[PDB]
């Protein structure tokens, strides 16, 4: 009965093999194909068991079906994933930890398998099974905050030891339950001066800085609203690709507009080193009717045009550059050139 996308499991297994020996250099970054695979593995993991059982629900509303062993162990996508190819990916994963990772395949496999298994980097689960029905809001919030923070903090530990600049896997949107992004930003950077380095974890910085200045629920100030499997998120600025990729949202989800502002919804690459986009203007549901691109070409990014922080919509940062060394992560190096290479679909 569960919807299990076996294709993403096969694509993930192939991605690990092709990258298991690729050493992480100073500017090494995860390619668009691999990001779209990682993006799809996590989203397919959630859709296998999308809701909690009515007799084992969280009174706080926390998505326990993606955080506890009780639901993850009977998640058919998690079960198929850990057993795929005689469980070879599980064998590789059991040998990895944060402090020994040196190659791309190790980096991707360890971070993703921890997420789809609900395990922190220290081995502890996100939420204990006994806490599924817990009413202790503050205690549950601390555990979810720890899991969400440690995913980003753990990758920064890797980036500081390797001296990498652009390796990035985000914390999916459901792990931000009651989490204060402004708190996560200050908690991590106040506690390790090495993360401030201009050549260390730039996409990790761009992901956390954006979330530090734009909350999850903007209420009356919200211009856009993403929703996937009940998990919602609001935006009032342009939404760069590293935000939609990091949180795990797709431009084919439920996008709702609350203003008449024009948005450019990039969905795919074209043969002219550009990006095809769809434009929306009216309020309401913005439905992308185009075909869903494959992992090689798929893009999730939105440029907002508001005439009432604008660098978030600049072409060369709203979309992650394919050249890893030319990825832009700040307003200082933000450029808006090359629009003649893009194409409107409408």
């Amino acid at each position: 009965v569960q919807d299990v996308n076996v294709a993403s499991i096969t694509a993930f297994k192939s991605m690990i093999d092709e990258t298991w020996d690729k050493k992480i250099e100073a500017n090494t970054c995860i390619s668009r194909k691999h990001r779209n695979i990682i993006h799809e593995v996590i989203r397919d993991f959630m859709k296998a068991y999308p809701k909690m059982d009515e007799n084992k629900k969280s009174p706080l509303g926390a998505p326990m079906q993606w955080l506890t062993q009780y639901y993850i162990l009977k998640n058919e996508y998690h079960k198929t994933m850990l057993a795929y190819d005689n469980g070879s990916l599980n064998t590789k994963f059991k040998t990895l930890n944060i402090y020994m990772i040196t190659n791309v395949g190790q980096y991707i496999l360890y971070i993703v398998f921890c997420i789809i298994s609900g395990k922190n980097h220290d081995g502890t689960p996100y939420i204990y099974d006994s806490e599924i029905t817990s009413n202790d809001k503050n205690f549950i919030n601390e555990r979810i905050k720890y899991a969400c923070k440690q995913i980003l903090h753990g990758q920064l530990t890797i980036a500081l030891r390797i001296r990498n600049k652009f390796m990035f896997i985000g914390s999916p949107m459901y792990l931000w339950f009651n989490v204060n992004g402004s708190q996560v930003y200050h908690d991590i950077y106040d506690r390790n001066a090495g993360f401030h380095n201009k050549e260390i974890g730039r996409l990790l910085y761009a992901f956390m800085y954006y979330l530090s200045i734009s909350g999850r629920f903007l209420n009356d100030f919200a211009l856009l609203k993403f929703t996937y499997l009940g998990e919602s998120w609001t935006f009032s600025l342009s939404v760069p690709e590293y935000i939609l990729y990091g949180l795990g949202y797709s431009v084919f989800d439920t996008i709702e507009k609350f203003s008449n502002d024009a948005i450019l919804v990039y969905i795919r690459t074209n043969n002219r080193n550009g990006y095809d986009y769809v434009e929306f203007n009216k309020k309401g549901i913005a439905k992308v009717t185009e075909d869903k691109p494959d992992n090689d070409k798929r893009i999730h990014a939105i440029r907002l045009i508001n005439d009432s922080h604008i660098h978030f919509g600049f072409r060369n940062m709203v979309i992650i550059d394919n050249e890893c060394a030319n990825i832009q992560s700040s307003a200082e190096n933000a450029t808006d050139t090359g629009h003649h290479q893009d194409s409107k679909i409408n």
Partner: antibody, heavy 125, light 108 residues
Framework: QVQLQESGPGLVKPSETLSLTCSVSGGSISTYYWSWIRQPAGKGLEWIGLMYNSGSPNYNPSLKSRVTMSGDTSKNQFSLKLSSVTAADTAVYYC???????????????????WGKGTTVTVSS | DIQMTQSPSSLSASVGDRVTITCQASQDISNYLNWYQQKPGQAPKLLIHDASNLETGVPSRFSGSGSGTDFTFTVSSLQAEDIATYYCQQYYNLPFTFGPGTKVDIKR
């Protein structure tokens, strides 16, 4: 481990320009927001102005013409310049880190949680 | 700008007493209020943010409440080391403005 330390000349002649510098360690000035606060001897605290991580400054309208705040990324410092000083500018000047919060409304929440030791400046001939 | 008042200007209490300081705003500032503790010879130390949320490491004897224009700061069991001047400060509108401060003295 964010730590701040003020520095500058302790004496400034009237009508001349006060110049102070805040040295930041344990993190980049481009990571946080900052602010200057002064307190005359035996009096209260007066907020002088803030500086965002982009370097854009916002000053107190009381001093809105005499103040200039700028950041130096190469030295990881930011400065405070106050022109046409009088005796009303004799005070202990503090620089502080302005931690922000944008997850409880669009109106940002700002807290001065990390303070420097402060420097004493006297306006006299 | 938004003007802050504090009452009393000073007070003397014995060790163990319950002390309460009040802070009033000239207009509605919601809970955009901070509480600082400035011990003699030191910079102000932030104790409570957003009217009621304690900073990390602040002793549990300190607490604050209030929303709108009137705010309250309470020390449940006053300690001898708590001798300082306590300020409230709003960040609802620019410029940020502080209160006149309340001096808390120890009676022995």
């Amino acid at each position: 481990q964010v730590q701040l330390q003020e520095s500058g000349p302790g004496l400034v002649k009237p009508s001349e320009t006060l110049s102070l510098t805040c040295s930041v360690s344990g993190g980049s000035i481009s990571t946080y927001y900052w602010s200057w606060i002064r307190q005359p001897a035996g009096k209260g605290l007066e907020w002088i102005g803030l500086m965002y991580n982009s370097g854009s400054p916002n000053y107190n309208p009381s001093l809105k013409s005499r103040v200039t705040m700028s950041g130096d990324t190469s030295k990881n410092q930011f400065s405070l310049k106050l022109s046409s000083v009088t005796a009303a500018d004799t005070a202990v000047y503090y620089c502080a880190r302005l931690r922000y919060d944008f997850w409880s409304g669009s109106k940002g929440r700002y807290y001065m949680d990390v303070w420097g030791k402060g420097t004493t400046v006297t306006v006299s001939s | 700008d938004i003007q802050m008042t504090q009452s009393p200007s000073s007070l003397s209490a014995s060790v163990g007493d319950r002390v309460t300081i009040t802070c009033q705003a000239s207009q509605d500032i919601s809970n955009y209020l901070n509480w600082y503790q400035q011990k003699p010879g030191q910079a102000p130390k932030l104790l409570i943010h957003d009217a009621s949320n304690l900073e990390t490491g602040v002793p549990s004897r300190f607490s604050g409440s209030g929303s709108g224009t009137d705010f309250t700061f309470t020390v449940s069991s006053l300690q001898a080391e708590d001798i300082a001047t306590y300020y409230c400060q709003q960040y609802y509108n620019l410029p940020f403005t502080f209160g006149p401060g309340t001096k808390v003295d120890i009676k022995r």
